[model samples]
Target chain A: QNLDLQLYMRDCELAESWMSAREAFLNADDDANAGGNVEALIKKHEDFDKAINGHEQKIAALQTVADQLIAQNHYASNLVDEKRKQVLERWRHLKEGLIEKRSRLGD
Target chain B: QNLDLQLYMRDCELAESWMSAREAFLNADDDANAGGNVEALIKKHEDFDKAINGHEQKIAALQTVADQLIAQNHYASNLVDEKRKQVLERWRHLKEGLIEKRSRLGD
Candidate 1:
């Protein structure tokens, strides 16, 4: 119900973080050359790889949540459609009944 | 490629705006009272109603974008898996071809 807002907020956070993490991970090629010695460079590369992998997994998880929210929003839109019809129908009845009666009394 | 980031950013914007628009729309019941005349109050209600409907439509459009992104991500992940396999196979070949020969020469 109300949780949809929270999910949407979470998606925003995830997308921003995922985007930044990806940008950093993609730019990290130079980091492999920064650390002195082969072993140190290897360690840096491994760290970058792991971090990118983590971001990927986060994206996957957040995508699942986004999918769920989309479905919920579809349901909500359908409900809104139903409610809109009902509102119009009720207003019509009021117009035909009370408003018509009031006009008749004026006559 | 780069378009995905832009789409993601648009989703974030749409989501935030949709949430705030819905919040304002729902709370706008009080605003109808501020208008002096019945016609003015009706106009305010109609305006809020239209604004909320516009937000709903925006959400629907953004959801479609999100669905496409999800599919693209899935395909990218599959490609990553294939690339990972290739990388491993190539590494194995290099190890067998070069490291083995180097070890034999040392021995």
Candidate 2:
């Protein structure tokens, strides 16, 4: 139970952290498209090009950071699950022991 | 030429300004998703829900802003083209007048 608690808490923390990051990325996407008028494409071709290029670079960098965080989350998820199973197995073993003792007394 | 230059510069400036706003928005997105781990979805379901909801609202707001800008851009597009045609027509009239004056020297 103690081990399970720690694992669960850690899992929760990791997930929360990742969620925060995702929100940030979403914001950027919104900004990029917001007011991204097509007219600019014809009227300010040069500026539009520069703006788009800048966004691409920034997005790439941001995704890289997201990837690393996601990777860690994946690792923690596996670990947490494994820890939970171990605890459950031990619990079942103890329950079996109790059940066996009762059956033997009846026989 | 002067009119064309001013019009062109205004177009450029509008686009550049819009681009800057988009860049800022993009930065926010980058930050949000950079560390946004998938694992967090399972580990911190509550947090995930909140984060996603937050993003939806922000994106909606941003898009609203974008739509307005695009509408204006469209309006500008029509106006600019209309003005361009008028200017060209005047220039053509002058050209035609010159052509008449240059009538065949042999005649």
Candidate 3:
């Protein structure tokens, strides 16, 4: 990803514009017609799904790390619990507005 | 790979035979006529190379753990130095045997 950013800097409008468009969608919630804007809402919904999935994939990878630590019997309390909590917190935070916003859209 | 092994156990004569054959190679170092065994010597060289590569890969992986410790300024002098010296000593001993053995073989 970093390589592509640098290598194709001159011809990177598609990717650059995608980021811009995503930014616009994220901020569109601030407007009065937040859910009324179909294209923006759809893009936001897709990004929200991606962000959720990304968080989930990250949590799975982290859990694998945690499993190793736990299996090794290298348990240490405060430090260990904090690390576990951090993963959970990040997972929950990403889901906060997303899942609720998604549920409201459906019957 | 484990999946393939379990799935192919019925048809695993080749891989099973390989493990058995390689077992003999491990015990061949002190045999009276070790060098005269041409096929075994070739196999031994390949196995030694694979073993060395495997150990090297493991050492490199472990070094990353050490590097992370040093990077974060959380290194323990006694523990870290012992770990470093162990890697160096093991490397030197392996190198000595490898050089001496390969030299004797060429002659």
- Candidate with maximal DockQ: 1
Q: Candidate 1 residues A17-59, lDDT tens each?
A: 5555544544454344343556655665565556546545655
Candidates' chain B TM-scores in the order shown = 0.54, 0.44, 0.38
Give per-residue CA lDDT, model 2, range B14-84, as digits (tens).
54454445444434532443333556534444543443354445434444544444344444434433433
lDDT of 2 at B107: 22
Writing each residue's lDDT as its tens digit, candidate 3 over A34-84 gives 233557655645655564454345334433533443332222222333433
- What docking tier does model 1 reach? incorrect
DockQ of candidate 1?
A: 0.02
Cα deviation at A104, candidate 3, in Å, is 75
- Evaluated at residue A90, the lDDT of candidate 1 is 38
Q: Answer with 1 or 2, whichever has the higher TM-score.
A: 1
Q: In model 3 chain A, which range of ten residues has the least summed lDDT?
A: A1-10
Candidate 2 chain B — worst ten consecutive residues by lDDT sum? B98-107
Per-residue lDDT tens digits for candidate 3, residues B1-107, read 22322233322333334434544544454343235455765654555556445434533443343334333322222333343344334434433433343233224
